Amino acid sequence: AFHVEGLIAIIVFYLLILLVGIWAAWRTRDIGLLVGGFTMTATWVGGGYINGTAEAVYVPGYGLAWAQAPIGYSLSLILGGLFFAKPMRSKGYVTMLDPFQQIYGKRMGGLLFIPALMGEMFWAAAIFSALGATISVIIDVDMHISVIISALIATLYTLVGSVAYTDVVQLFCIFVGLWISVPFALSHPAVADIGFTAVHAKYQKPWLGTVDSSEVYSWLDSFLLLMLGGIPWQAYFQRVLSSSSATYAQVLSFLAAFGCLVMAIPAILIGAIGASTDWNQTAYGLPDPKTTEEADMILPIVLQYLCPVYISFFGLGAVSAAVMSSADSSILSASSMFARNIYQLSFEIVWVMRITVFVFGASATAMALLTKTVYGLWYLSSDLVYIVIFPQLLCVLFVKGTNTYGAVAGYVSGLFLRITGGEPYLYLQPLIFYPGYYPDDNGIYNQKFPFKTLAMVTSFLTNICISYLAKYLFESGTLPPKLDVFDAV
């Protein structure tokens, strides 16, 4: 079962990427704009992005229409560059979570940090699942062992320790490996026409998908979740604030949105090919990946089984090295974020950062083992950030007069509505039943009502209303000044 040549391919491509990265630091017509756009693009585009996009297009329930994560995450970059970059630079922020700490305080900073940590952990679990899937496909060792060993190598690389300009190299490797495999994948005999499969059903439901009239309010509820929940993220905002000029940051965000839209095209195409593939003709055989509960592995499966041996060896393996190189970047960001926001500011740093790396890697790989979807992990990472952080970001940026009381009230109300609405991915039953609820195969009632958008708006309006209410109570003198536990007013 073990294949030596796949491991050699990963090792050679990883060493080549590392050599280019250290050579860039060894060297250390105004094309810095293009390189900055590539760098901003390479943050979101990784194993999780392309694997989740291919999965979302591949699954019959979703199709391309419900694959809102690439389009929504590009529109998040557009909306950030338009509206969020200029307030952030105008107010002089240096960190994404700095606005929360300035107004709400350090303890509420940690309270808002916890959903950010969980979003980072969901994203890292999706990245670990994608990387383990790719490794398990090409090396042909078991999925669980692949995830464990890949996460362990990433954890040791983060733990032990030049290496400059690597993001452009990983993005170029992913782009070349995908766009040199799509012509071979499309030309495979098993794959039918993807133009015909888009609107008509041959092997499964059409991969464009459809949105029912009742589901439209649901659809926007998802689309607003990914488009607005993808904005308050640390990896985007650190490079936004790092830029010297504001217009430079806006044009970088626009170029990044363009690059994300372009990089989604091979992922959507591979998802379409997987939805169009007659797997009985391929070496994968029957049952197909969605019956095998391996629909989250569709991108490595197409690149391995629908491409020639040399094309597979190069393209799938350049993708593997790039994804493993990008995997440790999320671990580093989340670990430094934990070390600085909680342990350093609120309460020598190297030991606690080491333990943070170890625990975050173990939790991410454990949930990568437990979960069976990459797109679901991506959506769930967006979900909690959209519910909690985004109303608070709107309140600290565009709303004047918000305070800690309204922050906690909106936090509690949004989390109460979100929890009582029920999350099918985490196998949580719903307590409050909005109109249009229906039970799925698992017996978890699924809401057709936009309860997540309602929860977001409720949290935002509760923040505003409770902030102004507490301000009026303390200003007029209705409540005693002694009962000021949060020191907001």
Residue numbers in the entry: 2 to 29, 47 to 179, 183 to 368, 376 to 517
Show passages lifted from the paper.
Mammalian sodium-coupled high-affinity choline transporter CHT1 uptakes choline in cholinergic neurons for acetylcholine synthesis and plays a critical role in cholinergic neurotransmission. CHT1 belongs to the mammalian solute carrier family SLC5 which also includes Na+/glucose cotransporters (SGLTs) and is classified as SLC5A7. CHT1 functions as a symporter that utilizes the chemical gradient of Na+ ions across the plasma membrane to drive choline uptake. TMs 1–10 constitute the core of CHT1 with a classical LeuT-fold in which TMs 1–5 and TMs 6–10 form two pseudo-symmetric repeats and TM1 and TM6 are broken into two short helices.
The CHT1apo structure adopts an inward-open conformation with a solvent-accessible vestibule extending from the cytosol deep into the substrate-binding pocket at the center of the transporter. The intracellular vestibule is surrounded by charged or hydrophilic residues from the cytosolic halves of TMs 1a, 3, 5, 6b, and 8, providing a passage for the cargo release from the central substrate site. Two major conformational changes are observed from the apo to the substrate-bound state. The first occurs at the substrate-binding site where the surrounding aromatic residues, including W62, Y67, Y91, W141, and W406, must reorient their sidechains to accommodate the substrate. The second conformational change occurs at TM8 whose middle part bulges toward the substrate site upon choline-binding. The subsequent second Na+ release from Na2 ensues the straightening movement of TM8, rendering the transporter into an inward-open state ready for Cl– and choline release.
